[PDB]
């Protein structure tokens, strides 16, 4: 998060007298007075821009109020409960407050109200796959081994966009399941051809089950998109198994061909009843099962 | 400063510490990954370190909570060293970090077991289906390898063999035998048949295909069991 | 009079989620009363601001309450939850986990 960062704060030996109600001094003169030792407890390693110059400045008003603006960059931690993946969302805290003065000595305050005070640019916008809903404005106290201290947090809201993750991974993998589905059409005697297709498709499957994490931590507990690749991969599975089984239970090698007349109990193997069966019935399953999966997941989340 | 001459000296420090892992039995190591601290210059004579509080001087250890480990314990030692130069102080911050198995479960074991399960399916097709049987043995093969080396790429180039080297290198030897099975089926039909036709638990009959593949249909799924139950066993 | 309400969590390792109290009076309106982060910094409600104070045990994976200064519109129902805040952190919508709730009454 890039910000202006500006302070405030009373300083009646800096009263004077003169021309001017304000002086707009450098950033030496900052250097050259006191000022807050602010930090952020979450941030890990920012920067204060110093191009051209030291982005601050100080101005003291008649009345010894001065008025202390930087412009910081601030990369912190955002702890995360990735249990929905890809379909979360964060409160990433930024949470500030002064290093060495205890509650006695210094204590911080929102200029406007609490709402009000943070504000964000419209036309600033970096994320890439999240949504900024808001920010919501707090202050609280922390009870550190030296003392305690003021700690003044933003806690922005972000919502995941799960628009890059249906086609990474949702699009294939339901994809290769069909694919897998296909397989019960052709016919019985075509072993070589069944046998490519279940082959093929787990393999397949495997492949994106084995990708999916490429970008996230490497946590413990399994995601849902986990559990959507172990249910495609369920399918999947269970495609190539029954495969197995009907082929078991075919009889003649040859196949039918095409000048011969069946009769009905040089004869031929019947279509299979598990074929039949299972042509209505696994893409009946997939669909409860995505139908279910989906509405199960889409609305988890708190609103405001 | 405090009235009575105490001094506070506090320092948000991040700082990167180098903790030589041995990962024989990686991912289901422990790692003891410490942090020493000591006086540049001064001898024991000059100052001397100590922890304030004592046991209960490092705090905030209960608070982490990293996404792959987690702290089974934290050590404080405190010692004098005979440094090259002199006698000096040392202080000592350890933690005993314990790797989280399911991360490892998800991603690399059940692929590979998967993939052997899907191997052993190729005892279930006819022995005249080469093209059916040969392109399961080789897909799983290839399914084996093409994962062992997506794996290995993301870790040091360390000179020992792991516990999930050992777990991979388990599943391709099922593999390959799986393949070599019906290697074997099919030297035993279409070579040695009709030689033995002009002349003329236990072990299975070699000379009746289908008693091979009835044997190893229950072999393979039973020797694999005893495998894991070995591998699992020993590593935990 | 002083007291000191105690909740423990079994089930999940709360090291990461943020622990909460909530106080409901009868009449049906939720009131928040103090929370605490992984970064154990504590916030409180402007009623009871350094009449309460939370503390948070995360080896045994508990949140505490110490109640001091108890006067009689303090007689109340009160919950302990859990859970990451989200458009929240004042606001019991944000809450993914809750108590069975505790009666506590003040007789004068």
């Known amino acids: 998060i890039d910000v202006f960062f500006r302070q405030s704060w009373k300083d009646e030996r800096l009263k004077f007298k003169g021309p001017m109600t304000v002086l707009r001094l450098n950033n030496l003169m900052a250097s050259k007075i006191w000022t807050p030792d602010t930090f952020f407890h979450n941030g890990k390693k920012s920067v204060a821009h110093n191009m051209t110059m030291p982005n601050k400045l100080l101005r003291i008003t008649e009345d010894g109020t001065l008025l202390y603006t930087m412009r910081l960059t601030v990369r912190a931690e955002c702890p995360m409960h990735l249990e929905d993946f890809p379909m979360d969302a964060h409160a990433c805290p930024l949470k500030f407050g002064s290093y060495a003065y205890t509650r006695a000595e210094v204590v911080y305050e929102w200029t406007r109200e609490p709402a009000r005070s943070v504000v964000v640019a419209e036309d600033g916008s970096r994320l890439n796959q999240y949504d900024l809903l808001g920010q919501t404005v707090d202050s609280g106290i922390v009870q550190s081994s030296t003392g305690e201290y003021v700690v003044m947090t933003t806690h922005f809201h972000l919502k995941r966009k799960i628009g890059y993750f249906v086609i990474q991974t949702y699009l294939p993998c339901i994809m290769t399941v069909i694919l897998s589905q296909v397989s019960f059409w052709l016919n019985r005697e075509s072993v070589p051809a069944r046998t490519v297709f279940g082959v093929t498709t787990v393999l397949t499957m495997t492949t994106l089950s084995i990708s999916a994490r490429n970008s996230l931590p490497k946590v413990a507990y399994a995601t849902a998109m986990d559990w959507f690749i172990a249910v495609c991969y369920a399918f999947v599975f269970s495609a190539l198994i029954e495969f197995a089984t009907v082929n078991y239970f075919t009889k003649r090698g040859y196949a039918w061909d095409g000048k011969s007349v069946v009769p009905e109990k040089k004869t031929f193997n019947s279509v299979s009843k598990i074929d039949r069966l299972s042509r209505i019935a696994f893409p009946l399953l997939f669909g409860i099962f995505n139908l279910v999966y989906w509405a199960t997941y889409l609305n988890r989340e708190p609103q405001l | 400063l405090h009235p009575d001459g105490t001094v506070l000296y506090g320092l948000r420090i991040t700082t990167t510490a180098a903790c030589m892992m041995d990962l024989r039995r990686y991912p289901l190591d422990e790692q003891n990954c410490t942090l020493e601290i000591e006086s540049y210059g001064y001898t024991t004579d000059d100052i001397e370190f100590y922890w304030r509080g004592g046991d209960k001087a490092v705090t905030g250890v209960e608070r982490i909570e990293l996404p792959q480990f987690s702290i089974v314990e934290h050590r404080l030692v405190s010692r004098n060293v005979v440094f090259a130069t002199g006698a000096y102080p040392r202080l000592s911050l350890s933690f005993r970090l314990k790797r989280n198995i399911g991360y490892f479960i998800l991603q690399t074991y059940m692929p590979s077991i998967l993939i052997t399960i899907l191997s052993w399916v190729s005892f279930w097709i006819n022995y005249d289906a080469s093209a059916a049987r040969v392109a399961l043995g080789i897909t799983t093969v290839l399914t084996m390898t093409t994962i062992n080396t997506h794996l290995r790429e993301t870790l040091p180039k360390i000179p020992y063999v792991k516990a999930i080297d050992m777990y991979l290198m388990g599943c391709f030897v099922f593999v390959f035998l799986a393949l070599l099975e019906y290697a074997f089926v099919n030297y035993i039909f279409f070579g040695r048949g009709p030689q033995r036709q002009k002349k003329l638990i236990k072990i299975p009959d070699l000379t009746d295909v289908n008693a091979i593949d009835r044997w190893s249909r229950i072999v393979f799924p039973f020797t694999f069991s005893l495998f894991n139950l070995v591998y699992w066993l020993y590593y935990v | 009079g002083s007291l000191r309400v105690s909740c423990a969590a079994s089930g999940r390792t709360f090291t990461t989620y943020i622990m909460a109290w909530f106080r409901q009076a009868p009449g049906k309106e939720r009131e928040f009363l103090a929370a605490?982060?992984?970064?154990?910094?504590?916030y409180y409600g402007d009623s009871v601001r350094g009449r309460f104070t939370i503390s948070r045990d995360y080896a045994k994976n508990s949140v505490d309450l110490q109640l001091d200064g108890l006067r009689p519109e303090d007689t109340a129902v009160y919950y302990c939850?859990?859970?990451?805040?989200?458009?929240?952190?004042?606001?019991?919508?944000?809450?993914?986990?809750w108590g069975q709730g505790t009666q506590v009454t003040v007789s004068s």
């Open positions: 605490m982060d992984q970064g154990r910094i504590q």
């Open positions: 939850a859990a859970g990451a805040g989200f458009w929240g952190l004042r606001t019991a919508s944000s809450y993914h986990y």
